[PDB]
Design an enzyme around this catalytic site. Structure first.
Site, PDB file in Angstrom:
ATOM      1  N   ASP A 134       0.830  -1.225   0.000  1.00  0.00           N
ATOM      2  CA  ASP A 134       0.000   0.000   0.000  1.00  0.00           C
ATOM      3  C   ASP A 134       0.855   1.260   0.000  1.00  0.00           C
ATOM      4  O   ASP A 134       1.819   1.358   0.762  1.00  0.00           O
ATOM      5  CB  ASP A 134      -0.828   0.118   1.281  1.00  0.00           C
ATOM      6  N   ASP A 148      -4.862   1.995   9.611  1.00  0.00           N
ATOM      7  CA  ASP A 148      -4.827   2.801   8.364  1.00  0.00           C
ATOM      8  C   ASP A 148      -5.342   4.206   8.648  1.00  0.00           C
ATOM      9  O   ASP A 148      -6.235   4.699   7.947  1.00  0.00           O
ATOM     10  CB  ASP A 148      -5.615   2.100   7.244  1.00  0.00           C
TER      11      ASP A 148
HETATM   12  O1  LIG Z   1       0.779  -4.247   5.085  1.00  0.00           O
HETATM   13  C1  LIG Z   1      -0.344  -4.146   5.991  1.00  0.00           C
HETATM   14  C2  LIG Z   1      -1.302  -3.036   5.496  1.00  0.00           C
HETATM   15  O2  LIG Z   1      -1.926  -3.543   4.303  1.00  0.00           O
HETATM   16  C3  LIG Z   1      -3.366  -3.501   4.363  1.00  0.00           C
HETATM   17  O3  LIG Z   1      -3.837  -4.756   4.864  1.00  0.00           O
HETATM   18  C4  LIG Z   1      -4.041  -3.291   2.986  1.00  0.00           C
HETATM   19  O4  LIG Z   1      -3.228  -3.685   1.848  1.00  0.00           O
HETATM   20  C5  LIG Z   1      -3.634  -2.385   5.390  1.00  0.00           C
HETATM   21  O5  LIG Z   1      -4.989  -2.378   5.950  1.00  0.00           O
HETATM   22  C6  LIG Z   1      -2.472  -2.607   6.390  1.00  0.00           C
HETATM   23  O6  LIG Z   1      -2.207  -1.408   7.118  1.00  0.00           O
END
Ligand SMILES: OC[C@H]1O[C@](O)(CO)[C@@H](O)[C@@H]1O
Ligand SMILES: OC[C@H]1O[C@](O)(CO)[C@@H](O)[C@@H]1O
Lengths: 490, 490
Positions: free
Chosen positions: A40, A162
């Site tokens: 991400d 997040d």
């Molecule tokens: O890498 C872990 C991160 O990736 C996610 O699962 C989405 O791709 C987020 O919700 C988390 O913060």
């Protein structure tokens, strides 16, 4: 032990495997780590005359693991340069990862607010973990210092992550994604006067579908006279052409001001109809465009790049604008024009029950393909992208006049996943496909930004060309514009 | 000069080229000439304890030309035997063809009523021709005598053909297809007390679409408490999944009795959603089933069999019944069960992201494939018919869970035409595909007869097998029944 030492160790591993990375799939003009795994995008910000993009990063190999924040910077959202890693897991509160988050300007201090992840009990998908919001600061934009835990969830709340933070009315707001006691995905709004002490404000959003158990990567921002919530729902069942990817990313448009409900005028719509679009985040550009960047990938997909000691690419940056009927028009940023090399223009190409090799290199290019939909009556007609010279391997982007849809089919693309994605034909005489090809990706902007399709491809051919094709009737291409696209790194 | 001599000459040409016909595409259990070209079925009748089928036939080569009536007979609508040609062009009124028509029982005398075709001026598609209805008789069911012209069109009417005649209220009715002065396709109803003197009764049917310029091969018959008009419209524009073939065949359901309009309760519906279904005609079976046979082909299609000195196949005979909502349920006749050989039953086959060679000969077989639609969530899942052992060549019949349609794709089938046809998934937990494979054809009956798909295929492989496949998710086959199908001729 110290984060400075753990960052040094991480950077040395990335540099060590950088020599093993093959060019065949490595993007020329998209963000990737020098080696190892990314997911991400994080901490998107215009700060001190530069664009920062961070990302979820496993430095030690090409698979997900102990998540760091990697970091690139650009002057122009285009010429991205690799920087040292920004955050490594180091404290009890983030031991098993510096998970996703955001950046803000705290009175001249670049501040990262991120989820600290720690596993309390290993039981695969039954694992227990702790997720809290944490804060780090930088004086120089490169080196970061952790300031500890700033938001802890209620008792019995585990999925809590997040954070996305913005300034409004002389306070700070935060949205986080939550799995609630009843196992529904929600976006919770919190607020703070000081970035350290936070109070729950309201459940900002929840979806009607009771099977949605998580809303990852929320971003809540104003656009025209509306508020838009971007998020990544988990648990939506694939239904006809809808919600085809393992996990969804999309937007909800509505009305909000502080003290009020977020009242929905436009229900959850996918941001991208292709194979590989996850975990969007936005920033405000210097000139006040709303810009979105996402992970150009999908959890649980085959990732052929992993044989080359790297994985993970981000999408092109895209502008968001509201249409008069409150849907997002999504366009590539204008600054990508700065990568254009040798231009080629072809006007008025007709095909009937035939194929034609355009003899144009499909390694790294930009196409604008304008198709006359009235006079293109072929059952299947369009372009074979990143194609072997024998036409046996290609990525098919075409009008299906039976479905009345645009099809992106990666069945014959090369290594990895098969099948197609699609959008409805727009209600317009002309279909414009604005296509960005990189070493392992296709991005399609339809007409004025009404729809986009983003899919990873892994071509195995030494030479990559473009074909036009018409099956069981005619293709009418009004105009085809082609540009070679330069390596963004030099 | 005499028709007896012209029939002898025609039969000798057919016998002469019969030795050059290869088995690779020649049907084992469908009607074809021994050699040369056939199109539309003609003169369908149960007469003197036998089933007669005639057809448009060019005896001199494998292309359309000076049209004769060829002839087969069966006791059981299944074990079809080739007979001598019935009609050759011979008179001024049928010099350039004995075009389509019907058979009736005129008080123990087998009577053919057919269009006589003569070209008045050669100008390609601008050609002027004369079409009148003509009558021939037989005492023995093999040798026919022409009795001359019985219906001539009004002045300025040129397209005037494909008579279908039935007995009602102690008179005879005739439907013909017409291109009217304003260039619209119409079905005209005529009547006669004696089969020789006919009077126009009414315009029975015309379509709302003003671009339909001809209605070929009309058949008007009672079914339950309704009248059904089957016909082949020309000039319908392909529109999404509708009217994909060069020319259409379909049905209109409504109310009629003598002296009344044909009032439409169910508007023009296609009879078959596949590639190769044209010019249907019906008969009443001994036990009063309504049976339909069509040309299993399409004007202007590539016809790979033409390299083997023959072309043209008729469909399986099918029952017509009205559903409670006045749509046709279409099923294969029960007598085809008499061709079944070695049976194989497989129960409960699950596939996920995998292919499986069933190791079953796909030269001439019958399948019943029952698919669990709830638990078959694959993007694409079903069967590869008439497949090369390497899986490179096959005819794909599958559930597309994005389209929510059944797809028959002949892109990889072998020689000739590419692309797909489709029907909507039925509103039922289970999809039943009743599949008939012959040397160059696939016929699919969906569920209780709600829909059919008929397409020609030209496989080039020496061995033909069946694969199951599931892409991007699961296939659940509740049951697969397989039968080898015996040559109908012995
Ligand atoms: O890498 C872990 C991160 O990736 C996610 O699962 C989405 O791709 C987020 O919700 C988390 O913060
Ligand atoms: O062969 C000529 C015959 O074929 C048709 O055009 C349809 O296939 C009929 O209308 C005609 O009587």
């Amino acid at each position: 032990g110290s984060m400075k030492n753990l960052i040094a160790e991480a950077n040395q591993a990335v540099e060590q495997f950088a020599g093993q990375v093959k060019a065949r799939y490595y993007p020329a003009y998209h963000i990737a780590a020098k080696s190892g795994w990314i997911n991400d995008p994080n901490g998107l910000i215009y700060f001190n005359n530069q664009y920062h993009v961070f990302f979820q990063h496993h430095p030690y190999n090409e698979q997900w693991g102990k998540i760091h924040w990697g970091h690139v910077v650009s002057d122009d959202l285009v010429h991205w340069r690799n920087l040292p890693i920004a955050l490594a897991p180091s404290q009890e509160y983030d031991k098993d990862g510096c998970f996703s988050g955001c950046a803000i300007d705290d009175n001249g201090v670049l501040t990262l607010i991120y989820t600290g992840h720690v596993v309390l009990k290993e039981a695969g998908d039954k694992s227990v973990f702790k997720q809290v919001q944490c804060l780090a600061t930088s004086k120089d934009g490169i080196h970061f210092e952790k300031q500890g835990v700033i938001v802890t969830p209620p008792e019995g709340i585990m999925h809590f992550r997040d954070p996305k933070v913005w300034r409004q009315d002389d306070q700070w707001y935060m949205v986080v994604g939550v799995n609630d006691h009843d196992n529904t995905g929600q976006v919770w709004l919190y607020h703070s006067q000081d970035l350290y002490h936070w109070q729950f404000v309201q459940v900002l959003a929840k979806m009607a579908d009771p099977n949605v158990y998580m809303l990852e990567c929320p971003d809540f921002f104003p656009l025209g006279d509306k508020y838009v919530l971007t998020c990544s729902p988990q648990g939506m069942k694939a239904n006809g052409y809808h919600y085809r990817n393992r996990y969804q990313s999309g937007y909800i448009v509505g009305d909000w001001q502080p003290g009020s409900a977020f009242t929905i005028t436009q229900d959850f719509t996918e941001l991208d109809f292709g194979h590989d679009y996850y975990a969007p985040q936005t920033l405000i550009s210097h000139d006040q465009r709303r810009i979105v960047i996402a992970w150009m990938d999908m959890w649980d997909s085959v990732m052929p790049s992993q044989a080359d000691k790297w994985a993970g690419v981000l999408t092109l940056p895209r502008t968001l604008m509201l249409s008069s009927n409150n849907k997002l028009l999504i366009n590539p940023i204008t600054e990508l024009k700065s990568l254009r090399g040798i231009q080629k223009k072809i006007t008025s190409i007709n095909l009937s029950n035939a194929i034609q090799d355009l003899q144009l290199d499909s390694m790294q290019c930009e196409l604008i393909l304008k198709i006359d939909l009235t006079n293109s009556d072929a059952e299947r007609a369009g372009i074979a992208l990143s194609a072997s010279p024998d036409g046996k391997q290609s990525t098919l982007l075409y009008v299906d006049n039976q479905a009345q849809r645009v099809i992106l089919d990666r069945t014959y693309s090369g290594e990895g996943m098969v099948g197609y994605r699609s959008v409805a034909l727009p209600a317009d005489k002309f279909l414009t496909l604005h296509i960005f090809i990189d070493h392992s990706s296709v991005e399609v902007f339809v007409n004025e930004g009404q729809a986009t399709l983003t899919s990873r491809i892994y071509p195995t051919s030494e030479k990559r060309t473009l074909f036009l094709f018409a099956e069981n009737g005619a293709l009418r291409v009004e105009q085809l514009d082609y540009w070679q696209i330069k390596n963004m790194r030099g």
